[PDB]
Amino acid sequence: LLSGTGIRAALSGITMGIPVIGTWMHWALFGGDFPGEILIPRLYALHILLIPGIILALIGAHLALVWFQKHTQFPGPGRTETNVVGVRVMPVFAVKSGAFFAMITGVLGLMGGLLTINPIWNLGPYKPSQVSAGSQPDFYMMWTDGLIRLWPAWEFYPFG
C-alpha cells in the first residue's frame, strides 16, 4: 500500500505530466495504464540486475580511479602534493579496512534485528482506493517528495 502509493504519485503522475512525451513515457514504462501487469517484473529486473550491474561497474571504476589516482590527503607535516603519507596496504590498512567492514556489517545486523523496517504486513496490499496518511518515500527520495509537496501548484495551460 505505502510503496504502491509512492509509485502512483511519483512514477505515474510525474511521468505522465511531462509535456511532449509524458504519457508516452508512462505507457512505455508501465506497458499501458498505471496498474499495468508488467510494472513490478520490470522493476525487479531493473533492481536485481540492470541498475545494480551499472552500480557495480561504476563502483569498480570509482575504486580503480581512487587506487591509481593516489588518494588525496589533508595538508600536514610531511604531506605535499607529490607524496602520500599514511600506512601501506598490507600490514595496517588492509586489516583496519576489514575490521571496519566487520563492524559496519555488525551495525547493520544489530539494526536489522533490533529496529523494525518496512512492516509490509502492517501495510496492506496495494489497492488504488486505499491509502494512509504517512505516504512517504525512503529518506533519500524524501527530498524529491518534499519538493513535490512544497512547490506552489503552478500549472500552465497552453493551447488546448
Binding site: 505505502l2 533490533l114 523496517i117 512492516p119 501495510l123 504517512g134 524524501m142
Partner: peptide, 17 residues
Amino acid sequence: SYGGYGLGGFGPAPEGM
C-alpha cells in the same frame, strides 16, 4: 512489532531518522 522496535508506526520517516 515483529522484527524489532517499530519506530512509532510510520515507516520512512522514523526509519530514516
